[PDB]
Amino acid sequence: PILLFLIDTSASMNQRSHLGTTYLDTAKGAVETFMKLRARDPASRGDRYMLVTFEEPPYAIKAGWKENHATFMNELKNLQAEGLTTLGQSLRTAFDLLNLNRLVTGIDNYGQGRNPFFLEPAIIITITDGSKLTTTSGVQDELHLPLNSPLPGSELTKEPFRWDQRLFALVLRLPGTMSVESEQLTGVPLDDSAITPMCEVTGGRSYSVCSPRMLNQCLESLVQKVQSGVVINFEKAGPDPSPVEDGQPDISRPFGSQPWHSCHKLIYVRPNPKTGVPIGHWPVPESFWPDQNSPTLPPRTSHPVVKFSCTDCEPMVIDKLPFDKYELEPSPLTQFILERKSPQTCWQVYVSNSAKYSELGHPFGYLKASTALNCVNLFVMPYNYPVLLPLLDDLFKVHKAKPTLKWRQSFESYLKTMPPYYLGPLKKAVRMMGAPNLIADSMEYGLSYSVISYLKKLSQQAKIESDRVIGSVGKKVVQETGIKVRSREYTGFQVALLNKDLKPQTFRNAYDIPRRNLLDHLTRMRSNLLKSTRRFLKGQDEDQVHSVPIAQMGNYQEYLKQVP
């Protein structure tokens, strides 16, 4: 998966703990221990770790997707605290980079459902202290994500993130003195910050830390949290389900929207161990009917908003049907299902406005408790499966893949109710049950040519944007000698600032060598020039730069002694 680290470089992390260490250094150590744990995980070969600061672009991004571990180490360690708490701008730049990468890859099936097997699982960790937001205008009390998007095509989604990106916020609350209280907490309390609502919306648990021990607990919690799945909004459809008759009727039941009625949850999408690619067959229906005459498409949400009808119904199964079974994250919803203890029934799941005439649409899947009652799994079938499956049963049990005209017209009415993009997976499903001529090759309900050309031009502009981001990434800060304007040698004067990367050439240039060392350097150049060996040197102190490698020294040297 993709690992991204948005790390604050505001002067707030120039505060120090009781350890004598700054918050910035604590963040760097936490990231180091994180990637050590991620290398302990064998998925480190698939892991990629990129870095974003809070400073203005083009220097906002530090490590691009083409960069390696050595450059990533160098940048993360050589970060310096000079920025401002511009959390909204930094988060916007990071999620803009993620969306640019996604639309460059083009797996975003806009207007064609949402394929669960197309995933780009990215986890972004934002490290802050939880101080107030800073802006050149002033202070800001709310995390206002900026609405002006120079990136084209961001209007196709209402939210800047997608369902495959999970954001987790670390909040540094280490006290100035040593905490006399010993932390007996076995869990991580939630923070109270403006990043917390956006964290919960995108599907993350923002953590606030106070000691290194529970910091390690938070870090290993995130390490266990590194998985691949889909973030889905779950909403209860229809009335409340029937309470279990084995328990007393609770008078004190709250009459309102439950968290298990409406909780945002992830569903794990386990890739095929044989291939390493996640496998799915049926995308979720869209929240609008796919119109072949519409020149524009409605903007879809970041997360698929589905509605589950709590009516217990029999999960019907027909052999050789390609269905998508995925395992859900534990939740109040899954807890309520496993409290109901009904693995033999299932609750239907729908997508609103999936049909032309039906607001709720037709059922496309169900949630079903596992046989061992340890979890709840989502089973995704073709849309309007209670209509399609009896037709398939009649065709392959009576008609023997030779459809009658009444079956053909019933199936065609089902196709008319069926949303246009599903024909492909339906064609593959029918050809793997064994009737490839049941659906002809002539009809293909494609999208409108205006939307297709708009998407192609959007992809071209995304390629241009990715090229210019690739060019922009890796550029260090530019130190200025600009003209300082002041009133009370004609208005264009600048006093030069001191540069650490000056590297004066005392031997080549005479305007170096200050007065104290003048005679000694003079004798030094004279000794150099009147020695005049094969090699002449322009720098007196060329000791080293950063590291001294034994392997590199032995490689530059030769050893003519095999001694076998």
Binding site: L502, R508, N509, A510, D512
Partner: peptide, 8 residues
């Protein structure tokens, strides 16, 4: 041929 300080 050096007429001033090198960085500036």
């Amino acid at each position: 041929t050096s007429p001033s300080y090198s960085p500036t």
